[model samples]
Target: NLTKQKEAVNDKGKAAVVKVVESQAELYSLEKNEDASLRKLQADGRITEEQAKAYKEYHDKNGGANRKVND
Candidate 1:
């Protein structure tokens, strides 16, 4: 009979990297054209591509470009 070794691993450290907003003020801007401004920021390299996406998401999720209550 031959002996075999059994190995075990933690198998719990694997995780997905969740992207988050780096700057609130950067995304939260009051402009006549919100999307245009966000694109401008992205083009200017002031914010990351992910940040621009985040802003767009917020605009859709928040119900409008401005995050105010019927203001």
Candidate 2:
């Protein structure tokens, strides 16, 4: 059998955490879409090499996965 960790019962804190996670998820999704756009632009030679590089850096940084823990 597996046991789960216990979390605090403070509604405010729980709500705040939920909001943060939602925001982070939305940001990740937007960054992913931007990356896809950059790919299409690059394929069509619409973006310069430097522009692509910058976009890749920004996309990689912001496109990282997020994890949350309950306690």
Candidate 3:
């Protein structure tokens, strides 16, 4: 079945997701000049293992956000 987003209730659902996505966009946009990110540090020293684990946990639980306005 095909489903659409953008209902009044789901609009609220996207508010938090939109914040995260927009923040990432700003960082990625600015850092487009470079190919590497914080991952580089974790790669070299594993100092970010806890952070990586948190992200992995989040991804495991919920990794995707539906489009705010499904077409």
Candidate 4:
């Protein structure tokens, strides 16, 4: 017997997952050097999505903060 499979229109669904944590300080602040690299590759799609998640996880786990040093 031949049957037609039903198709769903679940296309282009954008959901805002993960409630915002911390502040936009991370966005404006330049303390996270690795962050810049991650964002560059993430938005540019130079790396795989898995890799981007790794950066986020690692950064959140053992990231750093820096202060402007005087000469």
Candidate 5:
């Protein structure tokens, strides 16, 4: 039987998901902060400069409220 003849892709869509989720995960970590300011948050080192920039752009444009989501 030539069943195995057809090529197949590898498993574990980890790479694709990791690429997308990793960045957002860092962003979410910032969101989970004691709601610190941009500089203070950046100083923590738990987040990257890119994440800080994206968060800043979004927070600045948005309410920029120092509070939790849905609270």
Candidate 6:
């Protein structure tokens, strides 16, 4: 019964899951864009000194590490 139900509903469930995942990804992109814009404004002196310092620290902490390849 479990197998049969899974097989029957798999396609529909998968499509729904994919749609939700895509929506979440879009939201994440928007949030990241806003964060970057704020950071840029701070760096350009549009924001306060505290804002710039805080954003700089946050950016440094969250920025990803560089990748290295070894032979």
- Off by more than 4 A, model 3: 1-12, 34-71
What candidate 1 gets wrong by more than 4 Å, as runs, is 1-35, 61-71
Model 2 per-residue lDDT tens digits across residues 1-71: 95536555653443444434334434444654432343334455555435444444444543432221111
**TM-score against native, each model:** 0.35, 0.33, 0.28, 0.32, 0.33, 0.29
Q: Tell me the deviation in Å of residue 13 in model 2.
A: 40
lDDT of 1 by residue, 7-60 (tens): 336322111101123233334353332424444555565656565556556555
Q: By TM-score, how accurate is candidate 4?
A: 0.32
Better structure of 1 and 3 per TM-score:
1
Return whichever of 1 and 4 wins on lDDT.
Answer: 1
RMSD each, Å: 14.4, 13.4, 10.1, 14.9, 11.0, 14.3
> How well does candidate 6 score on lDDT at residue 70?
9
> Candidate 6 on 37-62: residue-level lDDT in tens?
43334345454435434433443443
Taking the tens digit of each residue's C-alpha lDDT, what string does model 5 give over 1-71?
42333333653343333333344444544666443444444466544556545555555534454421111
Q: What is the C-alpha local distance difference test score of each model?
A: 0.40, 0.41, 0.39, 0.34, 0.44, 0.37
Instruction: Indicate which candidate wins on lDDT.
Output: 5
- Candidate 2 regions exceeding 4 Å error are 1-35, 62-71
> Which candidate, 1 or 6, would have the higher TM-score against the true structure?
1
User: Relative to the unseen true structure, what is the C-alpha lDDT of residue 14 in candidate 4, on a scale of 0 to 100?
Assistant: 16
Residue pairs clashing in model 4 are none
Instruction: Itemize residue pairs with steric clashes in candidate 6.
Output: none
Model 4 spans with C-alpha error above 4 angstroms: 1-35, 62-71
User: Can you tell me which runs of candidate 6 are displaced by over 4 Å?
Assistant: 1-12, 34-71
TM-score winner between 2 and 4, please give it: 2
Error of 4 at 14 (Å): 29
Count the clashes in each prediction: 0, 0, 0, 0, 0, 0
Judging by lDDT, tell me the better candidate of 1 and 3: 1
Model 4, range 1-71, lDDT digits (tens) per residue? 95635543552211111111112223423444433444444345554446444445544442422211110
